[PDB]
Design an enzyme around this catalytic site. Structure first.
Site, PDB file in Angstrom:
ATOM      1  CG  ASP A 195      -0.325  -0.186   2.587  1.00 32.01           C
ATOM      2  OD1 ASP A 195       0.596   0.572   2.930  1.00 32.01           O
ATOM      3  OD2 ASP A 195      -0.800  -1.050   3.337  1.00 32.01           O
ATOM      4  CG  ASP A 197       0.423   3.651   4.505  1.00 37.14           C
ATOM      5  OD1 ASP A 197      -0.601   3.191   3.937  1.00 37.14           O
ATOM      6  OD2 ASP A 197       1.198   2.953   5.188  1.00 37.14           O
ATOM      7  CG  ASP A 282      -4.010   2.725   4.462  1.00 39.26           C
ATOM      8  OD1 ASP A 282      -5.062   2.314   3.956  1.00 39.26           O
ATOM      9  OD2 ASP A 282      -3.120   1.971   4.892  1.00 39.26           O
TER      10      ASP A 282
HETATM   11  O1  LIG Z   1       6.486  -2.956   7.812  1.00 41.59           O
HETATM   12  C1  LIG Z   1       6.405  -2.499   8.930  1.00 41.59           C
HETATM   13  C2  LIG Z   1       7.078  -3.186  10.035  1.00 41.59           C
HETATM   14  C3  LIG Z   1       8.023  -4.318   9.746  1.00 41.59           C
HETATM   15  O2  LIG Z   1       8.530  -4.396   8.469  1.00 41.59           O
HETATM   16  C4  LIG Z   1       8.978  -4.700  10.920  1.00 41.59           C
HETATM   17  O3  LIG Z   1       9.000  -4.163  12.042  1.00 41.59           O
HETATM   18  O4  LIG Z   1       9.804  -5.611  10.750  1.00 41.59           O
HETATM   19  C5  LIG Z   1       5.519  -1.342   9.369  1.00 41.59           C
HETATM   20  C6  LIG Z   1       5.419   0.013   8.674  1.00 41.59           C
HETATM   21  C7  LIG Z   1       4.494   0.902   9.088  1.00 41.59           C
HETATM   22  C8  LIG Z   1       3.559   0.855  10.040  1.00 41.59           C
HETATM   23  C9  LIG Z   1       2.494   1.466   9.441  1.00 41.59           C
HETATM   24  C10 LIG Z   1       1.148   1.265   9.708  1.00 41.59           C
HETATM   25  O5  LIG Z   1       0.439   0.687   8.820  1.00 41.59           O
HETATM   26  C11 LIG Z   1       0.556   1.764  10.967  1.00 41.59           C
HETATM   27  C12 LIG Z   1       1.328   2.533  11.911  1.00 41.59           C
HETATM   28  C13 LIG Z   1       0.758   3.020  13.125  1.00 41.59           C
HETATM   29  C14 LIG Z   1      -0.606   2.728  13.387  1.00 41.59           C
HETATM   30  F1  LIG Z   1      -1.150   3.192  14.545  1.00 41.59           F
HETATM   31  C15 LIG Z   1      -1.414   1.976  12.496  1.00 41.59           C
HETATM   32  C16 LIG Z   1      -0.836   1.493  11.286  1.00 41.59           C
HETATM   33  C17 LIG Z   1       2.982   2.296   8.514  1.00 41.59           C
HETATM   34  N1  LIG Z   1       4.310   2.094   8.545  1.00 41.59           N
END
Ligand SMILES: O=C(/C=C(\O)C(=O)O)/C=C/c1cc(C(=O)c2ccc(F)cc2)c[nH]1
Ligand code: NA
Length: 358
Positions: A195, A197, A282
């Site tokens: 996605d 964001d 998002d």
């Molecule tokens: O991919 C990873 C983590 C792995 O790769 C790892 O730790 O190994 C996350 C990226 C990430 C998190 C988000 C959310 O979607 C998000 C954030 C906060 C929230 F409150 C709700 C949704 C956007 N960037």
């Protein structure tokens, strides 16, 4: 000395230990599916620390002084050094419950409970689920099945950039002073993602103007025939509430989960079909004064965020979430105009977004 906290480590996308971490990530994912939170956390912390190494592990001696490597984890590393593969991760990849859960949750709108329900009904393939005449699907699952092939294909950077242009063009039409930032994996330097964001904020918008922007932007796309799916979650944000105590903090900002129609002509890449691609997008709207906390939370990774919040609580007696930073000793909320200021408040050396791939 390597810290046990991902927020005190620099984790870049040149992973020298993918052989070990891919196996640990599979074992952690299986423990999530088996509802074993503890074993899941142990494998996630081990995988995270190895991702930060500037060299590949080539012997057990190389694991000396590395934190978060328990006896169970060291047995898995030993096995991979021995034969180039993990017998434990191989057994998970061949497990019928694991295969079903990965396959079913790969559909937009399908979570752990629906995947478990379908498995206990005897379903094993998406073809048999879709064609079943007794099953009832949520509006989210209908969209998940209709645009399955496009959503399962990786979003690349030219596509994310094409979506960014669409988001910015729509947003500035209603709020010309608005700041739009791409967050998530692409902000951390990833080539692909599932996605795209964005964080949206406006220095001059009112509380009402900032509430109406996501409704205006999605109605504009609906009129233009680009809105394939839309779910807007209203804000439950509380200006004066203390930040979350939880391991995984909830985001209370106004947000929307979308599927947009991305015309191929808008994508400026090195490279047919229907001429468009369905993209999961998002959008998050936050008050201007909380933009640094929201940016920090939405940039990730998930492990980096967990360790940031754990470090704030256990080491600094501070409470951190996507909305605020509270000092329990000074009994004051700490202000920040940038992520750098949040790191400085926490007593941490600044970690660049491309170094947060924990
Ligand atoms: O991919 C990873 C983590 C792995 O790769 C790892 O730790 O190994 C996350 C990226 C990430 C998190 C988000 C959310 O979607 C998000 C954030 C906060 C929230 F409150 C709700 C949704 C956007 N960037
Ligand atoms: Na899913």
């Amino acid at each position: 000395k390597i810290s046990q906290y991902a927020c005190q480590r620099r984790t870049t996308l040149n992973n020298y230990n993918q052989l070990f971490t891919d196996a640990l990530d599979i074992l952690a994912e299986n423990d999530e599916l088996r509802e074993n939170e503890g074993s899941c956390l142990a494998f996630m912390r081990a995988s995270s620390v190895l991702k930060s190494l500037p060299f590949p592990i080539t012997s057990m001696k190389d694991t000396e002084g590395i934190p978060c490597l328990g006896d169970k984890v060291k047995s898995i590393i030993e096995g991979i050094i021995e034969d180039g593969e993990s017998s434990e991760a191989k057994a998970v990849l061949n497990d019928e419950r694991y295969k079903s859960f990965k396959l079913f949750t790969s559909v937009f709108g399908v979570g752990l409970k629906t995947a478990e329900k379908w498995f206990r009904m005897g379903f094993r393939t998406l073809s048999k689920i879709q064609s079943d005449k007794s099953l009832r699907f949520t509006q989210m699952q209908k969209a998940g099945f209709l645009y399955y092939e496009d959503l399962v294909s990786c979003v690349n950077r030219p596509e994310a950039e094409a979506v960014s242009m669409l988001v910015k063009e729509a947003v500035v039409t209603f709020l010309p002073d608005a700041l739009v930032t791409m967050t998530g994996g692409f902000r951390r330097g990833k080539m692909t993602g599932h996605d795209v964001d964005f964080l949206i904020t406006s220095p001059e918008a009112t509380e009402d103007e900032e509430q109406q922007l996501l409704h205006k932007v999605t109605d504009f796309w609906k009129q233009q025939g680009l809105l394939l799916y839309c779910d807007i979650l209203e804000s439950t944000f509380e200006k004066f509430k203390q930040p979350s105590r939880k391991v995984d903090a909830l985001d209370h900002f106004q947000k929307c989960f979308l599927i947009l129609k991305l015309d191929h002509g808008r994508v400026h890449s090195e490279k047919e079909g229907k001429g468009w691609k369905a993209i999961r997008v998002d959008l998050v709207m936050c008050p201007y004064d909380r933009r640094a906390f929201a940016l920090l939370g939405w940039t990730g990774s998930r492990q980096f965020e967990r360790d940031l919040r754990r470090y704030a609580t256990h080491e600094r007696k501070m409470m951190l979430d996507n909305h605020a930073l509270y000092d329990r000793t000074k009994r004051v909320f700490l202000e920040a105009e940038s992520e750098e200021e949040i790191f400085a408040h926490l007593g941490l050396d600044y970690i660049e977004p491309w170094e947060r791939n924990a």
